[model samples]
Target: KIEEGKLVIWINGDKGYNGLAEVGKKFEKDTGIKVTVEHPDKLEEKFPQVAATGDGPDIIFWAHDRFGGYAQSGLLAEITPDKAFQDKLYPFTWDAVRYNGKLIAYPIAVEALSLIYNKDLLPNPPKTWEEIPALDKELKAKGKSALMFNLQEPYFTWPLIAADGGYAFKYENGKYDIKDVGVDNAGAKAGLTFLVDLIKNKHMNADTDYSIAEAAFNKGETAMTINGPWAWSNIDTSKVNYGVTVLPTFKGQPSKPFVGVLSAGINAASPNKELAKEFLENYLLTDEGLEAVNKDKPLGAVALKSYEEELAKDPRIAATMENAQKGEIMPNIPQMSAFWYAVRTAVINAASGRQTVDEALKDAQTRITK
Candidate 1:
């Protein structure tokens, strides 16, 4: 009923916020319900505690990975989109927002990492892991790295794990079966060993941070990189002609990266529930809102069916969407927190040769469990 004259929104400093600010202005002009967006420096840390005390923004914008934790803590309200609206979005978008079978957020945009290669250097992007060795040899002969990504980040290495059937948790019984940890499993061991071999062979390194890898890609020092849309704008294409494609196949399966849905969730303690729903479903989810959010960000296959043709029109967006379609949704379960640190530590240990692949992954498994 909008008994209150205004509502608050929380967002980060990313380009997406510019779009939200535009939408906020339009919303106020149309509905007379003033919209205030609060960009706290540490929203992730501040939100949970304040929401529990009934003093947080009514709407919060973020990725889907935190949905499970927030929803379980009773900080997020389950959103119910009408059937017509639900039918218009890709099913995976819904998968990203759902926690224990309840939709806790409205998915705005969808993204996943893909193998972006230098088109001028390679005739074609690698189609399989088997092809990588020869490609790497050629690149090194020419004094370039064949594949470079943020090796210190587990999210980037996750594709390798998935390609070999290594999953952090078995999704069963409508929840992630935390008991079914797969970090030290056969597939994981193989994946970890393969990564270690790559480091040993000079194919990639643990020291290649985001800035270093990004500079390498832009300077054409690397033939390929595994990254997502967030890095798209920074790629200096004037000299480096790049192409985006699905990651090369491994063990007969494509490297399946984690697909993240950029979304907005409502605080359960908010006084303006109905008002918030109206703003989201009617304002933010509309064609205009989607377009504006994407204006400054040349990214993501949005959840709306209306954007299907739009996304396909751009080769980069098309390839990103294709990779995402073939990937698994980022698990929003609270246990995912443990998975990040565990995988990162394991990957570091294996890469640095400080611990055997099995030993490092075993340590990861123990960390997740304990």
Candidate 2:
């Protein structure tokens, strides 16, 4: 009952996408299905518009968050990857793609913040936040800064915020309660206070942007920094000997960063549904496909459990896997947009020491709930 011989997929033009394109060639010869991979502009809006007419991509490679809304709208196909394949994937990645208790996408890679440190400068990273001050002092004598990261971006602040009980929304009834914003809570104030103190004591500042942090780490100007896989492309192994480990503890609690799974979803209305499913099952979800994805960009730990040993060969992936294993999921809901902007402002204000942590976070909660 196959009507069309062609299938289409939409993905960003990242290195991962390039790897997929390379793998598509073998899939093309194996099956008579001609595959088209496109990097369309404004794909977020374009996907919903075309998908409504049953004319969008048969598969979409993107982050898992958008899968929730798309699945709710009946725009995504419910795919049951084979039990064996499913068993090979990480539970958290699988859980991230579910909506209304049903899986709607195939999970691929995961990301979370980890402590990136220079092995030569610090034999061991700090175990707790309180230990940073003493370590910073010790490293200063050796002409190296203790830690550095952009204080202006909230994505990096998630660990500190959550360690103090400041979640974006409470998860109840198997869904995020958007109305239950936690930015203004007492725990938020406590978390933000610690961030401000980092700046107040000259540990880090707003000027410590991504470029500066990466460059400093490469040049051995800094001993350690908090970052993730995205920074891997900038790290020069020839100059800097680095290692990755979990973020340090805060007030006797493990820092829980916002974790996200990169995934691919099938368009429910595609004429080539069967082909799409087969591609995901027989190819993409397998080790061959994952190896291709990682070839161009070793973004982090892959979701497949089978590749655990293969991936650990690279120390960066090993650290990223550790971070993902210890972190909490980033809620995949429409309200997350609000959460990002609100928390970004709160972190900026807190780091600048312009307002009390309470005052800064109060406005963040108001904006998130509004």
Candidate 3:
């Protein structure tokens, strides 16, 4: 079953492939293994098909969300990093890669929502949700909005919903109990109600979707909006005088956004399992390897604590790191599909006033359970 001197890796896009390819050259020289890094289109869809049949690449690099399904399907090998190496990265990075209490991947980058505000409009970003109403009035008098984002999106609104302790599923002993859904809990109701009140009082637009909210922010029509590092490309092009900070507190509780991770996982069916493990641990996780990736494509928040000083030079990345440290990792289980559908429906219903917060959330809980 030995693949002999060859190793194959699949990445979803050119950004990762371009950087990893640079690292692969060094790995080839060090181990005498020929490395092939492929950026095949539709990798998420195609990988499962080929990997399930024992014909996929030696490794697949993508978002952590997909790996839970991969691990459940027996497509990924569990990664066992020593405690020393584990301690070098943020704890939540490990949380992002774990599935069913097993570490199935290595986290390379982390991302989370932060408050992005127009500095010219608001000299200082609000520290608490209680400050929003007065700011909204001040901005309204000046023909602008105080805050805007995709109102009906669970991903965008999760910070508000989770402020008082809402969570998608219960995590205990390094695993999530899918049966213990909490989207309809009292804390969640209070949070969603806060959003509904904002809409009713004309502080926020109920119909504002991602595109509308982002466009408004880009045009300086809004004082603040919530977004992640991925949106920086478009925001930079707009040249808005923007600043980034952690999300405001809600009712004396910190607003916690969901942290997402991009990671690399070894295919369980690969013939070169040992070599794949060695390559990741000895080469990819090293300072040189991460530096190469960051130089090629700026990472949102480098998972390694070693890069803290270097990463802090960029304020946006620094703010993202602050939020990520306080955030919860997005659940990686396949059951998350049902959770998303249920929460999205509830968000839309409550935001649009089609249903009360309690009605929408209870209905969502029924949908998730049923």
lDDT of each: 0.68, 0.66, 0.68
Tens-digit lDDT string for candidate 3 (1-370): 3265678878654476667888888889988899998877776677667765677788777665565566667776778765666887665566556656666567777656566666665668777766666678776777767676667566556556665566552446544455677876787787788788987887777677678766765675554544454565545545757776656454466655556666767777777877887888777787778887776666663646766656777786776677555556764555665565677788778887789888988888888888
Candidate 1 residue pairs that clash: none
Residue 347 error for model 2, in Å?
1.7
Angstrom error at residue 249, model 2? 1.6
**Each candidate structure's count of clashing pairs:** 0, 0, 0
Error of 3 at 351 (Å): 3.3
By the TM-score metric, which is better: model 2 or model 3?
Answer: 3
Candidate 2 lDDT over residue span 1-370, tens digit each: 1237677878643657677877676678889789887777676787667766667777876664555556656676778888987787666566666655666566777665566656665668767666665666666676655666565676566556655545552445444444577776777666677778766666656667787877775675654544554575565433556676656454466644557666667776677877887888777777788788787765463757777667778786676676555555664444554565677787887776667778887788788767
Model 1: per-residue Cα lDDT at residue 292: 79
User: Candidate 1: deviation at residue 84, Å?
Assistant: 2.9
In angstroms, what RMSD does candidate 1 have relative to the true structure?
Answer: 4.3
- Which window of ten consecutive residues has the lowest lDDT sum in model 3? 169-178
Candidate 3 deviant stretches above 4 angstroms: 1-5, 12-16, 40-56, 87-91, 133-144, 168-181, 200-202, 214-226, 248-251, 255-258, 304-324, 331-341, 352-355, 366-370
TM-score per prediction, in order, is: 0.80, 0.73, 0.77
User: Model 2 has how many clashing residue pairs?
Assistant: 0
Stretches of candidate 1 off by over 4 Å are: 1-4, 38-54, 66-69, 72-74, 133-135, 139-143, 168-181, 217-229, 248-250, 255-258, 306-324, 366-370
On TM-score, the leading prediction is 1
* Candidate 3 residue-wise lDDT at 220: 54
